[PDB]
Design an enzyme around this catalytic site. Structure first.
Site, PDB file in Angstrom:
ATOM      1  N   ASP A   8       0.867  -1.167   0.000  1.00 51.60           N
ATOM      2  CA  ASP A   8       0.000   0.000   0.000  1.00 51.60           C
ATOM      3  C   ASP A   8       0.909   1.222   0.000  1.00 51.60           C
ATOM      4  O   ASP A   8       1.539   1.526   1.011  1.00 51.60           O
ATOM      5  CB  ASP A   8      -0.879  -0.012   1.250  1.00 51.60           C
ATOM      6  N   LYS A  70       2.745  11.698  -3.490  1.00 51.14           N
ATOM      7  CA  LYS A  70       1.665  11.018  -4.209  1.00 51.14           C
ATOM      8  C   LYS A  70       0.650  12.020  -4.764  1.00 51.14           C
ATOM      9  O   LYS A  70      -0.161  11.690  -5.624  1.00 51.14           O
ATOM     10  CB  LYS A  70       0.970  10.024  -3.279  1.00 51.14           C
ATOM     11  N   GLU A 171      -7.153   0.728  -4.848  1.00 52.84           N
ATOM     12  CA  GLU A 171      -7.132   0.585  -3.400  1.00 52.84           C
ATOM     13  C   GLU A 171      -8.440   0.068  -2.773  1.00 52.84           C
ATOM     14  O   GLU A 171      -8.402  -0.774  -1.880  1.00 52.84           O
ATOM     15  CB  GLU A 171      -6.601   1.878  -2.750  1.00 52.84           C
ATOM     16  N   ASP A 194     -13.070   5.306   0.909  1.00 56.08           N
ATOM     17  CA  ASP A 194     -11.666   5.391   1.302  1.00 56.08           C
ATOM     18  C   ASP A 194     -11.181   6.834   1.273  1.00 56.08           C
ATOM     19  O   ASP A 194     -10.939   7.405   0.207  1.00 56.08           O
ATOM     20  CB  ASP A 194     -10.797   4.512   0.384  1.00 56.08           C
TER      21      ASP A 194
END
Ligand code: ATP
Ligand code: ATP
Ligand code: MG
Ligand code: MG
Lengths: 600, 600
Positions: A8, A70, A171, A194
């Site tokens: 992850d 990211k 994800e 999420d």
């Protein structure tokens, strides 16, 4: 070869897991933590830090501590979201030669994938330490709503870290696998919400039982890749800045050290308010006036925080509506609501989601580890070790091209299952230029450009009936591949891509080499520490030698050894490796000499 | 009634688990953490903190922050271990009226079980929040090597927290249950080495398959209940204090506040040295002098740390030898070595243990959660939900009595399986005084006294042949119960206990009530904070009211509302609940008054 590890790769935190035979297991890093801060730092004396050690020194080294990369990966410098961050981030964001968003540290320009590679390298070494063998293959996660450039850039990061990326997994899809592994969680439809440090995803996922195997199918996905905890922090930071300004008449924004302390305190305050109803932001000596030092002390209630970020939370609800519409389902059709991500710990977030779905989210899903676990499960499906488990995911964005009039013309609709393929004749022989984009907006200008794909003509020839057929493949990673061929001859046609985002092969190879050189540099840097430890051992033993000698030791010999002891202690206080090694050598010689005389 | 929860009550950290159907699950607390600091604090302003909130303010509240109470529970004030801690612990440790080791905060004397009860209350509430129903029953852990007083005092803490303690479980036994639950771990003998923040245990445990049920039997146990991470920290702190003396000519030990920053820095440094080989203790403005402020800056290597604590690690090896001897096994008989406890993360600890056993410890056991998981499993075995699991534990200390000549005479040998019972006639009618002790030493003076158990004579009577039989029961909790009867008449004999440690029934009842009063007080303390939140909501809405009115708002009205707003804001900065409530009412009235004039 070896184990396929599941990583992850998070905006804020990263997590690695493996298949332990038939059971997935999250692995602790060297620091003993089950997650690792996605933070990379370069020190004044030239060291590269990753994870907790990097996080710890950010307050005093804000310019050269990289975080939230990211949120830059796969983006262009002139992107609105990036342009905003340029003014916010403490580190230097610049344009690469091709216009991509890069960073600069101590004069060195670096691509986001190179930076994220350093985090991936640590997750890799984490697995290697645990397993006692090399790891060369991985499943790496990306937000479901990541576009093509973001996906490829993440895949590139894996390569730069020395990992063959067997799968890029969305994800929420990973979280679903982790949730659904538990026997007795089958034949249901779930919503995976999420909300992390940087991105927001919503996926609607059906878990079924077909031919004895458990199947996972993503029915729809949506979200916002630039909506996350960082944005909540920012709202709170701005409030604190404004209050201090009103209170003390000082604007802290031009003070890098103050702003770094404030960022840290703001996130801590935010986190406290998920459980307490009030929190105290305290920053002694935050700045100084001609009047003397100033201290920030301000109480923040949960009510205040909620008023500062409610619109951010509301921004996460609208994609939920679209996802359900795209899935063709109502809230009533959802059996389970699953929360993933640290930012979902906010009571307002949970309350808004519960109220939207008309039911309480499950409490038995790990919001920090489900994604990594699912990545490992995916790895095990690939290696054949996980049996009777199949998944079917989608592409999140419509793939289209700019056609005459500046319009967006869709070739592959959002939520089409992948892999998928669309072929179309574009030319009877003339040269062709294809402007490929991703998005749902009607005008090409309002969608994300992937690049211009150019084909040369095919020359006239007797009995030649050229039919240039262009094929758009989206693979299991969710990544586009455009190819072309003349159906008439079967001959492949070369496509030249212009104005696209991303790293070329030559850059990637160089960055792979650079990462290895960094590892070598790290081993080098360690030398000093190793030498220091040896020095302490040497001091310890030689002191015992002095003690054991007691009075039998002549004044001159005692003076010599005690001088050598102090000289080594002094050197160890310093940063000069040569001096330390020289003082160790001299101490060892004196130790040896007295030893010999004692034997006499 | 309800779920039996499993609570690992640790010196440093606590952890709660349940049986989630057929699978154990560790529960996050309100703060979102899977473990909870075993720390309680009382602020100057009169608030009670538990867990992370207490931990966060410890550095600035030396006197009213209570930690490591597990090292005092069930001990006497004049105990060597306690007497040493008196001079070291920042908070005040006093002698209770019966000579038990207690603490005193702001003039209030408190028993260790009252403090541990606060921690247990949070773990109870943690489970209640998760389950959505009351919890009234628990399995609570203790170190295997805990003696009678420590066991009972821990049980009393459970009761004070409002829990019925269905089982006190030995911590390595709990870890074994956790490890052995995984099908395919049967028919093996394991060594569980548990080194935590405060206690050290070693247990040798056989896992077998009997009649289709898995059985766990403790073959031998040993340890040191006052050996743990706190002692490692202490070694490093003392070293830093001594160095700063030499270096800067200042003694920090007389100084509570400097020692707090140092204690925190020492623990962090110790932890860093489990992964890195060097760490920097950097404490700017650590203290002051006539020369001005002083700053601590000292690099500590792993070699240095190891030289400081190696004897503590060696202290943990000697009980391993005794345990194997007691079990009648060699290291080659041990199939798996299991490490439990955060302090086992130290490389030197892992290396010494591996070298002793001649094999590497397993890596697939959670050193922070296995104990709580096992406690939950034990609960499930009790409720009958966990099937085909049986366990058999022992008492860790020989139970004896002081007999003529001051000698320790053993009645029940160490490592006897429990429950167990021993009976013996002590008199033919004369009064009897029995001095009961626990320990392996030859002289009663060198063992741990449990108290004097006294029986009155039985008067002479025709045809009477009194035979006063005394029975020593050790129950499944490992706790002693002494009873007596005249075998001749079957009549029970009253035993009066003198010089024993622990709480009496009246104190326990009082402390239960006090714990409930605290909860009410904590609910009462909250009001200031809860009113603030309402205040902020009120401000937010009424400000919108002003904005909406625009220029349409008359000067005298605009002035009145603007003044009401500032007044509330000022009051909110304050600490006066009455004033806040008053300003809220006044703002509400002006908000209403304007509203009414607008409608006109
Ligand atoms: N108790 C809490 N309440 C509110 N926010 C929290 C809490 N704990 C952590 N967070 C926030 O959660 C975020 C990190 O969550 P997480 O680790 O899931 O993100 P990530 O997976 O790294 O990010 P992404 O998926 O967006 O790339 C941070 O913004 C952090 O401040
Ligand atoms: N990486 C590490 N290296 C060395 N020590 C560590 C590390 N992490 C935590 N510790 C130490 O472990 C101790 C806490 O361990 P743990 O939480 O298992 O104890 P506990 O269960 O509360 O205590 P006990 O079982 O002794 O009552 C502390 O002393 C802490 O400093
Ligand atoms: Mg995430
Ligand atoms: Mg423990």
């Amino acid at each position: 070869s070896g184990k396929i590890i599941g990583i992850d790769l998070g905006t804020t935190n990263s997590c690695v897991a493996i298949m332990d035979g038939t059971t997935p297991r999250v692995l602790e890093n060297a620091e003993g933590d089950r997650t690792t801060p996605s933070i990379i730092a370069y020190t004044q004396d030239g060291e590269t830090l990753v994870g907790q050690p990097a996080k710890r020194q950010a307050v005093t080294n804000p310019q050269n501590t990289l975080f939230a990369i990211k949120r830059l990966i796969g983006r262009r410098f002139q992107d609105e979201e990036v342009q905003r961050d340029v003014s916010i981030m403490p580190f230097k964001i610049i344009a690469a030669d091709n216009g991509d968003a890069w960073v600069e540290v101590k004069g060195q320009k670096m691509a986001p994938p190179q930076i994220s590679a350093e985090v991936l390298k640590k997750m890799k070494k984490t697995a290697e330490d645990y397993l006692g063998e090399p790891v060369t293959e991985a499943v790496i996660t990306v937000p479901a709503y990541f576009n093509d450039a973001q996906r490829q850039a993440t895949k590139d990061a894996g390569r730069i870290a020395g990992l063959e990326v067997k799968r890029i997994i969305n994800e929420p899809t990973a979280a679903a696998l982790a949730y659904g592994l538990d026997k007795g969680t089958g034949n249901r439809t779930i919503a995976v919400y999420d909300l992390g440090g940087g991105a927001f995803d919503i996926s609607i996922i059906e878990i079924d039982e077909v031919d004895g195997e458990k199947t996972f199918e993503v029915l729809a996905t949506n979200g916002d890749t630039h909506l996350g905890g960082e944005d909540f922090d920012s709202r709170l930071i701005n409030y604190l800045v404004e209050e201090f300004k009103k209170d003390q008449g000082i604007d802290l924004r031009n003070d890098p050290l103050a702003m770094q302390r404030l960022k840290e305190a703001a996130e801590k305050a935010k986190i406290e308010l998920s459980s307490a109803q009030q929190t105290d932001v305290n920053l002694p000596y935050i700045t100084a006036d001609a009047t003397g030092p100033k201290h920030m002390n301000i109480k923040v209630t949960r009510a205040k925080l909620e008023s500062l970020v409610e619109d951010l939370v509301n921004r996460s609800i609208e994609p939920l509506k679209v996802a359900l519409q795209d899935a063709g389902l109502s809230v009533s059709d959802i059996d389970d609501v699953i929360l993933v991500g640290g930012q979902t710990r906010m009571p307002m977030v949970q309350k808004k989601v519960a109220e939207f779905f008309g039911k309480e989210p499950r409490k038995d899903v790990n919001p920090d580890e489900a994604v990594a676990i699912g990545a490992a499960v995916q790895g095990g499906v690939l290696t054949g070790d996980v049996k009777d488990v199949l998944l079917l995911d989608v592409t999140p964005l419509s793939l289209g091209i700019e056609t005459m009039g500046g319009v967006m013309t869709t070739l592959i609709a959002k939520n089409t299952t992948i892999p998928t393929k669309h072929s179309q004749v574009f030319s009877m022989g003339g040269a062709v230029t294809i402007h490929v984009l991703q998005g749902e907006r009607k005008r090409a200008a309002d969608n994300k450009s992937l690049g211009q794909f150019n084909l040369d003509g095919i020359n006239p020839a007797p009995r030649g009936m050229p039919q240039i057929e262009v094929t758009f493949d989206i693979d299991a990673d969710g990544i586009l591949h455009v190819s072309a061929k003349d159906k008439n001859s079967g001959k492949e046609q070369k496509i030249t891509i212009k104005a696209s985002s991303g790293l070329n092969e030559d850059e990637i190879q160089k960055m792979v080499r650079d990462a290895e050189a960094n590892a070598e540099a790290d081993r080098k840097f360690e030398e000093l520490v190793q030498t220091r430890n040896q020095g302490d051992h040497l001091l310890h033993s030689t002191r015992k030698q002095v003690e054991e000698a007691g009075d039998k030791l002549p004044a001159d010999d005692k003076t010599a050894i005690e001088s050598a002891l102090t000289a080594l202690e002094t050197a160890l206080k310093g940063e000069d490796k040569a001096a330390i090694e020289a003082k160790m050598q001299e101490l060892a010689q004196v130790s040896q000499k007295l030893m010999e005389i004692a034997q006499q």
